[PDB]
Amino acid sequence: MREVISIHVGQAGIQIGNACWELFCLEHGIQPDGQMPDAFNTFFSETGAGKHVPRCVFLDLEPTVVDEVRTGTYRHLFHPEQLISGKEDAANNFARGHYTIGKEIVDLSLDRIRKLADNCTGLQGFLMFNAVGGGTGSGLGCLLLERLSVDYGKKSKLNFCSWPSPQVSTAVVEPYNSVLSTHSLLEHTDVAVMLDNEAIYDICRRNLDIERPTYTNLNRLIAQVISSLTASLRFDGALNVDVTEFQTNLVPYPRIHFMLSSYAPIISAEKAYHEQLSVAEITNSAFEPASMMAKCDPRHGKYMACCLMYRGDVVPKDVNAAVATIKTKRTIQFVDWCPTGFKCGINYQPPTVVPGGDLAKVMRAVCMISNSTAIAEVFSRMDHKFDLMYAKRAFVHWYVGEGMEEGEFSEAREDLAALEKDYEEVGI
Amino acid sequence: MREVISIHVGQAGIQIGNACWELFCLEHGIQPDGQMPDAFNTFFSETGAGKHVPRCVFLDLEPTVVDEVRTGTYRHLFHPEQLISGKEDAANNFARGHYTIGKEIVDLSLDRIRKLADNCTGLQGFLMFNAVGGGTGSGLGCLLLERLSVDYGKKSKLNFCSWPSPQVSTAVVEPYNSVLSTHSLLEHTDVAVMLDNEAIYDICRRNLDIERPTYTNLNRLIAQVISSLTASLRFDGALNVDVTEFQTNLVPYPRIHFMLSSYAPIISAEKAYHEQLSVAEITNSAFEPASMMAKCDPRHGKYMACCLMYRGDVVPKDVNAAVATIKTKRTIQFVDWCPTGFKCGINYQPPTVVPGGDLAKVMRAVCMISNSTAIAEVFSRMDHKFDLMYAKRAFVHWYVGEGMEEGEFSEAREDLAALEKDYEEVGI
Amino acid sequence: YALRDHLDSKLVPNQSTDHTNVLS
Amino acid sequence: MREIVHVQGGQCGNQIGAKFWEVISDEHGIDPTGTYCGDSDLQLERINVFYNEATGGRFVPRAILMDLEPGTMDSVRAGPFGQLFRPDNFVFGQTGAGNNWAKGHYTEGAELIDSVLDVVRKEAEGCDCLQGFQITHSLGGGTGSGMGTLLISKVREEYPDRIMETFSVFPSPKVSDTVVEPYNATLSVHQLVENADEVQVIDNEALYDICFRTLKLTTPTYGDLNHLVSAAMSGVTCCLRFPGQLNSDLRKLAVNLIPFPRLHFFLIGFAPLTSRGSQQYRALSVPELTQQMFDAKNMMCASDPRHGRYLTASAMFRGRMSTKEVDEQMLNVQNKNSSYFVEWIPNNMKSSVCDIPPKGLKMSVTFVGNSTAIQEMFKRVSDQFTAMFRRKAFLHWYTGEGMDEMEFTEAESNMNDLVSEYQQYQ
Amino acid sequence: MREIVHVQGGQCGNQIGAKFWEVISDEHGIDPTGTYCGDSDLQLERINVFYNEATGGRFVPRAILMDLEPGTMDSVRAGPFGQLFRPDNFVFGQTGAGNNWAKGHYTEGAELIDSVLDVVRKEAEGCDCLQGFQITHSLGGGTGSGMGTLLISKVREEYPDRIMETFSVFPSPKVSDTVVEPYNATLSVHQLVENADEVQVIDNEALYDICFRTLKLTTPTYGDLNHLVSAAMSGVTCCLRFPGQLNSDLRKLAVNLIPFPRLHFFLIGFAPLTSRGSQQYRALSVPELTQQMFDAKNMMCASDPRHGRYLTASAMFRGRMSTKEVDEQMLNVQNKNSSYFVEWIPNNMKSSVCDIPPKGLKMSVTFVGNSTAIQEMFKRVSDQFTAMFRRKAFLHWYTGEGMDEMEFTEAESNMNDLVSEYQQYQ
Ligand SMILES: Nc1nc2c(ncn2[C@@H]2O[C@H](COP(=O)(O)OP(=O)(O)OP(=O)(O)O)[C@@H](O)[C@H]2O)c(=O)[nH]1
Ligand SMILES: Nc1nc2c(ncn2[C@@H]2O[C@H](COP(=O)(O)OP(=O)(O)OP(=O)(O)O)[C@@H](O)[C@H]2O)c(=O)[nH]1
Ligand SMILES: Nc1nc2c(ncn2[C@@H]2O[C@H](COP(=O)(O)OP(=O)(O)O)[C@@H](O)[C@H]2O)c(=O)[nH]1
Ligand SMILES: Nc1nc2c(ncn2[C@@H]2O[C@H](COP(=O)(O)OP(=O)(O)O)[C@@H](O)[C@H]2O)c(=O)[nH]1
Ligand SMILES: [Mg+2]
Ligand SMILES: [Mg+2]
């Protein structure tokens, strides 16, 4: 039995999980009541006669997001006790979500970790979905990844984090929450995919040409990425890349596990039939420097280990010819210590469409989880965000007033500072 | 023929009897008019053609708790002289149920017990059903059992008293009634299982999701537990359990007969078909520390023996696999002098549902009665509330002035000291 | 109710009666 | 000639044996109504081994049924192949052995003893001879372990020359019910060494392990538990019922399988035991039956014979196979792995060939081997007995019903003599 | 009546070997449900070599499927000609061992070799001489190279004189998937040089190159890359299954191709290979079949034999032939190309004519050649290994599963030794 548990913490975690579970239910044929009219085993159980309950722990510290799912069209699809709801929020304060308010809600949520793991045989990992840019996702994100590392600390941890955005930002204490989250994201995390905000905004500019799309359209693009991550688990494939191969061919040293995503083609109904979208062209747009969901230019960085997740009617020769043409391109600069570096997998299942979505019927799609040294400057801007605010102790009287000692700011700053030093010495 | 006698006494006596005898009549195809439109032989008789008359001895001192069944929907069900009530209650006073008023009602109550046991083909048990911190349940229970040990001093006597709770409470004389009625529960009771009222409260709040259970909803959960205890005496079965098999196999050293109880699943209609009710999962909920129906958190004790009953469509191969996971769980530990022992029966008939109740239709059930040494912590909190009230002789003149002499308090204190003591070096 | 002793094996034991893609 | 009488005892004894009279009646071709439909003489030439004759041509099993609790008596009578039993062979109590060994041997089971020896006497005395008595019981319970071995002792007094074939279910190592497993087990193997004969071994976790790997039952049943034992019933008693080339009655099994008188614990096993998926892919020949029957994943005991050494072994072949094709297979399996056969007895194996196969299969073999490895089981019975007895557990039933703790500690002292005796014979 | 135990390991080995079992089933008349279909005795008498005999009647293959991921064997079972296989020889595992030689050799696959080797024993001692262990596995993954290295080691210590062939596929330089492929090859060659008799080296670029410039396939796939390997493996073991003028089995291949025991990494080939118009346009003379063996284009290595010296070369001819042109086509290629052949061996050649051609064609050749030019394979694997190991890239998931860095330095020391003795032999 192949299965994996999806954690969703935070406002971003639940709302990305809404698009994820919408798309996973569509692919497996499971209706919003659970009754469909062995591919389901990774994301759904077999309760009752046809009740396929999804495999997730919806956790947030507010009522507002969780109860609205409990009053939505997916009310009697989830197990309603899997939707653990908090009672007051962390209030964009890492101290509240990690020390005072989060010291109770983790105990109930980990109780559903125990039941979702005992219900299943052959557990593989934890797809945690959290924001980092505020409370809850950083606070409960820290505390859940700590205690899951001591009682389930032998399995993979795929954490698709939402790092703070470079220029646009909908919080001012947001630099404090993510500097105070690399103390858990550095060691209590097996893979930390960094997703951004303008990076899906400007994929939506140039590719989907939607002038004014919403967070729902961001979450749909992330959901199509996640369905391509765990694509060889549920479905068949020529080259299958299971959860332990996304990390034995991508993580070169135990500290360097901050990878970046690249789906292609994020294409609308207009341009889909106007192009001949094929295995060579899709990976050329996947290596386009603006196609990162990070706002992180891979040109002033350099690659170390790239993973490709071809999906649909893809023939293995065409992976080979397209990987060769990517390798011969001069602007794409790999590393000396990896003559290889293209972990390619092929799924026979074509990518699905959400009806009335933003994506067209496309036969072939490539997801690209790539590890480079360019991720270092993503942390370098947030290091500069930290030290203007911490120059004269701005917004500290809530962090220290809720239980933290004041030294945790400098300890997390020097830990984050040693991370870019590690990313600079890895590419000498 | 298998038979047993039920000895409901007190408000917790009669009202639990109303829930258990509505359950026993519905599961056997017995209508409230009395007749049926071979498992009946252990709870009903055969006066004439049909009219399965129950074999309760429903007893109190005040008439206002027995009169609503003397005029209720089950009026033409019981023998009216099995419904025995005097004029005035004991009023939370042991001496008013054991030395004063009560002699002139024991001679009629055991009179009716004689000519139930006469039309029996080999007697097996005496299910006593009482409150213990109260009045008639304590005093009249102690007189009736002290003289049940001489005229039938050979059969088993399975008591099911409802202990006073540590935080929840109902009257100021719990220490002054239950502490000294352990004389009845130690030298005259062969198995005593305490069903604390506080535990039945929150087990409805968590599992059933009713925030507001009334005494009627409590008594239906207890009625389910009795229906699963004396279940192999009724239906065709697998590995079977009798009351003598329950007696000799659960119970260590003769004074040690104070046990917990737990039902599983106690799920409601919503939380019923969103999860699979596998044999492994329902016995984990049976063993989990918040499911014990007394606040006796078994991680601060020492399990000695457990007797489980798998009612319904339960396969013993699933049973042996499930209890093996209980051994491997380091949370649930067992004493060194009892290295093995998970005495388990399996009935065939599925658990019946009370129409209009709060439990859902489940193919399976697990009823566990276990003898952890954390049951001594019942008496550790209970003695604490005894000594400091007795320190300045509070409420003592209502006792020494009615029928009793001072001195019973001090030796019942010695009895509780030795009761905690015998639970200490047995588990050392 | 003899549902426990189901005959899941006849007189010879031989127990009683009861995705892949294409790379052609 | 060769009367064998089933003395079915305990809950477990009556459904083990109800399937015994379901597979023996199938092999001899008897309907549950008591008539015959097989149209063959060789089927009806040793009916008297297990079936006394009755008026109107109806056969009855020579089978005393015995319990203290009438619930499992009702289940045997109600089930198929169950209304063939004589109703006064239904010797049952109304109280119930509550898994207490004192409750069978020194109180209420002992007042039903004078009734159960009466019905044993009536179906044994009036005949020409009887080869022995067959007894299935449930060591670890109340009835089969309890007055069950009291019927073994009293039959041993009445007929101290006939063989006692006892199919006993020892307690499971992994997990089981009935917390008083150790108290019933050692006290019963006290007297199963001296008023006894071949005491062959059957275990519930063991037989489970066949029906998970060897047979791949996804949902096994207790009926499948009794059916694999019931297949071994016919194999161990086959030359007493059907002709062969080298006939071997059940006493001939004992004489060439017991070196010293207390050394009488025998692993039982059945072959072929093939799954449906592998039904048509594998073949059926003597090298495959031998590889399967010495395979420790097939043995009906949870003791692993590779952690030991075969003292002497025996086999019950049944089919149209060559007596040559058996006997260099015995030689070859003795010569490859000689580390698992004793050196002080040369050529450690008897072979028997019955002409007539079991029902269905073209060929089949049943293994009855006196391996010394059974002290894996016996030390497991010992080390849980030491835990409960050293801290005086549960004894207020065993002494309050009419014994003392002398009988417990010398049952332990007999028991440790048994593990010692197998040890230097290894 | 010599047997071959065929063990397929890894996802790649399972797919390559499944294509082998359909190109040998139609070559022997075996239906997907095993039944011979025609009426030729020459197609059936040597069925014992790669098939067994069932009492059902079907000729199950002597195949052992072997892969820690239970998804590829589901594909083999549900595919065509997958109903032939015995379900017992489907040793599963449920963990994956994903692209890790440490997990394949020391971690999780370690408690699976004790169960696959039981299946190997059940197939191996069922005869009186085994000829070889034909093993197909990958060297770029975890289950293939790792537990493949476990099985080659324990089979050799159990069986010291039995042959074991290894149609192993090596990691590919130009484009390859697994990033830790140089780690998965350097640690596998070290045991593939001391416990192996024959290692037929196969890549992926030259198999793509064959179906690009001999067949002109605009649409190749992984199936037809495997059908070329299966055709080559069929012709190598052709004399063991079919009569011929000059029979030459697998041991004859070994003794006449290796000068000294470590130099046993051969190059495989198959050389009737026609295009679309060039099926009608191609002659079927022996000299032309000799021409297509000795081309760098029709080599399954991409390790060009022109850049090197043929130590020894052999060609397993098949079909209705003339026994003289089979030899002076070897003599003329050794004389018109004399600088491409080692001087201290006159007659670097073997020809072996079997008389049963593949179906449809008139003749066939399978070239097995020991060359100096396998230098290039080991030196570029050393180049990919040293580039990452000098900075310890991905090392801590080989040390984390339990190793030490000296095992990597010894693995490169053996394979940098492997380029050395091929160098003075040139
Ligand atoms: N990708 C994506 N990011 C979101 C979404 N909603 C909020 N975010 C990001 O999340 C960050 C703030 O944290 P939230 O997830 O909204 O809320 P929270 O993590 O639960 O923290 P609290 O509000 O204190 O409870 C913002 O900086 C946003 O960038 C969304 O729908 N999609
Ligand atoms: N579980 C449960 N407990 C009850 C119920 N009714 C009363 N009790 C318990 O009964 C106790 C009261 O003592 P009782 O002996 O029953 O009262 P009584 O029968 O009128 O006797 P007196 O005290 O002499 O008046 C309280 O502690 C309650 O916990 C009920 O319906 N369900
Ligand atoms: N195979 C089989 N084993 C049984 C059966 N009934 C009981 N057992 C096993 O026998 C042991 C003790 O049997 P029990 O019923 O308690 O004692 P009994 O009433 O004298 O047979 C238990 O561990 C059961 O697992 C049965 O019908 N078949
Ligand atoms: N020729 C061929 N090669 C394959 C096939 N499947 C996988 N491969 C090769 O194997 C490599 C992937 O590693 P894999 O063999 O799956 O690792 P494994 O799971 O340990 O066996 C790729 O480089 C492929 O070239 C196949 O069906 N045919
Ligand atoms: Mg929020
Ligand atoms: Mg009252």
DSSP state of A210: -
Identify which of B375, B378, B351 has the alpha carbon closest to the alpha carbon of residue B364: B351
| Rounded Cα gap, residues A343 and A326, in angstroms | 13
Cα dihedral across residues A403, A405, A411, A416: positive or negative: positive
Do residues D182 and D377 lie in contact, with contact meaning Cβ atoms separated by under 8 Å?
Answer: no
3-class secondary-structure state, position A194: strand
Omega cis (within 30) before A265: yes
**Backbone phi, psi, residue B34, to 5°:** 120, -40
On whether the CB atoms of residues E9 and E66 are closer than 8 A, the answer is yes
Kindly calculate the radius of gyration of chain E based on its CA atoms and give it in whole angstroms: 21
User: Which of D257, D184, D166, D190 minimizes the C-alpha distance to D417?
Assistant: D190
Contact of A287 with A374, CB cutoff 8 Å: no
Shortest alpha-carbon distance between residue D223 and chain C (Å): 4
For residue A44, the SS3 value is strand
Residue B297 at interface with chain A, using a CB cutoff of 8 Å: no
Q: Chain C: residue nearest B239 by CA? A: C4
**What are the residues whose beta carbons fall under 8 Å from the beta carbon of B251, sequence distance 6 or more?**
B190, B191, B257, B305, B371, D394
d(CA E129, CA E5): 11
* Exposure string for B384-420, b = 16+ CB within 10 A, e = fewer: ebbeebbeeeeeeeebeebbbeeebbeebbebbeebb
- State which H helix or E strand residue D365 sits in: strand D363-371
For residue E3, list its beta bridge partners.
E130
Sign of CA dihedral B244, B246, B249, B255: negative
Length reported for chain C: 24
Contact D162, D135 (CB under 8 A): no
Cα(D118)–Cα(D108) distance, integer angstroms: 17
D181 is in an annotated binding site: yes
Residue of A131, A150, A245 whose CA lies nearest to A188 = A150
Inter-CA distances, A235 with A28, E64, E90, Å: 10, 25, 21
> Of all helices (H) and strands (E), which one includes residue D383?
helix D375-390
What atom of ligand 4 comes closest to residue E204's alpha carbon?
25
State the distance from the centre of ligand 3 to the C-alpha of C2, rounded, in angstroms: 16
- Residue B346 to residue C4, Cβ atoms within 8 A: yes
Q: CB under 8 Å to B41, separation ≥6 — which residues? A: B1, B2, B3
Residues contacting residue A392 through CB under 8 Å, at least 6 positions apart: none
DSSP SS3 for A12:
helix
Q: Which of A38, A39, A236 sits opposite C21 (nearest CB)?
A: A236
CB D308 within 8 A of CB D400: no
Phi-psi map region of D2: left, alpha, beta (phi>0 left; psi -120 to 50 alpha): left
Resolution of the determined structure in angstroms stands at 3.3
What's the token pair of residue A402? 């809720």
| Residue E204 assigned as binding residue | yes
> Does the beta carbon of E98 lie under 8 angstroms from any beta carbon of chain A?
yes
Q: Is E108 annotated as a binding residue?
A: no
- Active site includes B245? yes
Q: What is the dihedral of CA B264, B268, B269, B274, to 10 degrees?
A: -60
Residue E15 assigned to a binding site: yes
Given a contact cutoff of 8 angstroms between Cβ atoms, the answer to whether B69 and B125 are in contact is: no
- Contact at CB, A53 and B284, closer than 8 angstroms: no
Calpha distance E351→A362 (Å, rounded)? 54
Q: What is the DSSP letter of A97?
A: I
CB-nearest to C20 from E79, E221, E223 is: E79
Check: CB of residue D269 under 8 Å from CB of residue D384: no
Respond yes or no on whether the N-terminal peptide bond of residue B37 is cis (omega within 30° of 0).
no
Pocket of ligand 3 (CB under 6 A): B 239; D 10-12, 15-16, 97, 99, 138, 140-144, 169, 176-178, 204, 222, 225-226
β-pairing verdict for A123-131 and A156-162: parallel
Top residue of E55, E86, E92 to mutate, by most chain D CBs within 10 Å, is E55
Query: What length does chain E have?
Result: 426
**Is E246:E351 a contact under the CB 8 Å cutoff?**
yes
**CB within 8 Å of chain B, chain C residues 1-24:** 1-4
Amino acid identity of D148? G
In whole angstroms, give the CA distance from residue A58 to residue A83. 5
- Measure in Å the smallest separation between the Cα of A343 and chain E Cα atoms: 4
Which pair of tokens denotes residue A382? Answer: 């947030």
d(CA B83, CA D232): 59
In degrees and rounded to multiples of 5, residue E29 shows phi and psi of 80, 10
Task: List Cβ neighbours of B230 (8 Å cut-off, separation of 6 or more).
Answer: B4, B42, B43, B125, B127, B243
By what method was this entry solved?
Answer: cryo-EM
Using CA atoms of A219, A224, A226, A229 in order, give the dihedral in degrees to the nearest 10.
-160
Query: What's the token pair of residue B401?
Result: 């002035």
Crossing angle (nearest 10°) for helices D181-191 and D405-424? 70
What are the residue ranges of helices labelled H in B91-242?
A: 95-98, 103-117, 139-146, 148-151, 175-178, 182-186, 197-203, 215-229
Picking from D224, D226, D228 by the largest number of C CB atoms within 10 A of its own CB, the best residue to mutate is: D224
Chains in contact with C via at least 3 Cβ–Cβ pairs below 8 Å:
A, B, D, E
Of E372, E118, A348, the residue nearest D296 (C-alpha): E118
Contact C23 E78 (CB under 8 A): no
Alpha helices, DSSP H only, in B230-298? 243-250, 279-287
In sequence order, what DSSP letters do the residues of D39-83 get, joined into one string? --TTGGGSGGGTEEE-TTS-EEE-B-EEESSTHHHHHHHHSTT-T
For E153, counting Cβ atoms within 10 Å of its Cβ (0-12 exposed, 13-18 middle, 19+ buried), the class is middle
Question: Other CB atoms closer than 10 Å to residue B150's CB: what's the count?
Answer: 8
Among A8, A11, A181, A226, residue to substitute to test ligand 1 (most atoms within 8 Å of Cβ) = A11
What are the Cα distances from residue A246, in Å, to A18, A40, A258, A364, D58? 24, 21, 12, 20, 73
First to last CA, chain C: 52
Chain D contact for C24 (CB, 8 A cutoff) = no
CA dist D15 and D8 (Å) reads 9
Element (H, E) at D169: strand D163-170
Residue B427 forms contact with D (CB below 8 Å): no
DSSP code at position B164: P
**Alpha carbons D273 and D363: distance in angstroms, whole number:** 11
How many angstroms separate the CA atoms of B402 and E212, rounded? 110
State whether residue D280 sits within 8 Å of chain E by CB: yes
Structure tokens belonging to residue D62: 């020579």
Q: Establish whether B121 is an annotated binding residue.
A: no
Does E122 lie at the interface with D, CB-CB under 8 angstroms? yes
Which of chain D's residues have a Cβ under 8 Å away from the Cβ of E54?
280-283
Largest Cα–Cα distance in chain D? 63
Residue type, D75: S
From residue D264, alpha-carbon distances to D155, D267, D370, D418 in Å are 18, 10, 7, 11
Helix (H, G, I), strand (E, B) or coil at A155: coil
Give the integer Cα–Cα distance in Å for D292 and D284: 11
CB B164 within 8 A of CB B382: yes
Q: Can you read off the two tokens belonging to residue E252?
A: 């004859």
What spatial distance separates the first Cα and last Cα of chain A, rounded to whole Å?
44
Tell me whether strands E3-9 and D310-319 are parallel, antiparallel or unpaired.
unpaired
How close A208 comes to chain E (CA, Å)?
A: 31
Q: How far apart (Å, rounded) are the C-alpha atoms in residues A189 and A153? A: 10
| Nearest alpha carbon to residue D271 among D306, D246, D307, D300 | D300
Cis, peptide link before residue D272, omega less than 30° from 0: yes
Q: Which residues of B fall within a CB distance of 8 Å from C4?
A: 238, 316, 346, 348
From the list B146, B198, B245, B420, the catalytic residue is: B245
Q: Residues in chain B, how many? A: 428
Residues of C in contact with D231 (CB under 8 A): 13
As annotated, the active-site residues of A are 245
d(CA A66, CA A367): 30
Residues 268-327 of E with CB under 8 A from A: none
The chains in contact with chain B, meaning 3 or more Cβ pairs closer than 8 Å, are: A, C, D
B338, HSE (Cβ side, Cα atoms, 13 Å)? 29
Please indicate whether, in this complex, the C-beta atoms of C8 and D221 are within 8 angstroms of each other.
Answer: yes
Angle at which helix A316-328 crosses helix A279-286, to 10 degrees, equals: 40
SS (HEC) of chain E: CCEEEEEEEHHHHHHHHHHHHHHCCCCCCECCCCCECCCCHHHCCCCCCCECCCCCCCCCECEEEECCCCCHHHHHHHCCCCCCCCHHHEECCCCCCCCCHHHHHCCHHHHCHHHHHHHHHHHHCCCCCEEEEEEECECCCCCCCHHHHHHHHHHHHHCCCCECEECCECCCCCCCCCCCHHHHHHHHHHHHCCCCCEEEEECCHHHHHHHHHCCCCCCCCHHHHHHHHHHHHHHHCCCCCCCCCCCCCHHHHHHCCCCCCCCCEEEECCCCCCCCHHHCCCCCCHHHHHHHHCCCCCCCCCCCCCCCCEEEEEEEEEECCCCCHHHHHHHHHHHHCCCCECCCCCCCEEEEEECCCCCCCCEEEEEEEEEHHHHHHHHHHHHHHHHHHCCCCCHHHCCCCCCCCHHHHHHHHHHHHHHHHCCCCC
Question: Cα of A308 to ligand 1 centre, how many Å?
Answer: 28
* Closest C-alpha to ligand 3, atom 7: D12
A368 closest CA partner among A158, A251, A218, A225: A225
Ligand 1 pocket mutation pick from A162, A203, A293 by most atoms within 8 angstroms of CB: A162
A21 alpha-carbon distance from chain centroid: 14
H or E element in which residue A271 lies: helix A269-272
Containing H/E element for A128?
Answer: strand A123-131
Calculate the CA D347 to chain-centre distance: 26
Cα of B136 to ligand 2 centre, how many Å? 9
* E strands in D220-344: 244-246, 265-271, 310-319
Sequence-distant (6+) residues with CB within 8 A of B287 are B262, B326, B329, B332, B368
- Hey, which residues 69-98 in chain E have their CB within 8 Å of chain D? 86-88
Contact C21 A39 (CB under 8 A): no
Amino acid at B193: V
Within 13 Å and on the Cβ side, how many CA atoms surround A167? Answer: 5
The CB of B18 under 6 Å from ligand 2? The reply is no
**Terminus-to-terminus CA distance in chain D, angstroms?**
39
Angle at E404 between CA E190 and CA E9, to 5 degrees: 45
- Shortest Cα distance, chain E CAs vs residue D285, angstroms: 8
C-alpha to C-alpha distance for A120 and A43, rounded to whole angstroms: 11
User: Scanning the structure block, which residue is given the tokens 């989990």?
Assistant: B288
- Report the distance separating Cα E184 and Cα E189, nearest Å: 9
Tokens representing residue B137 in the block: 């349940």
- Please indicate if the annotation marks B197 as binding a ligand: yes
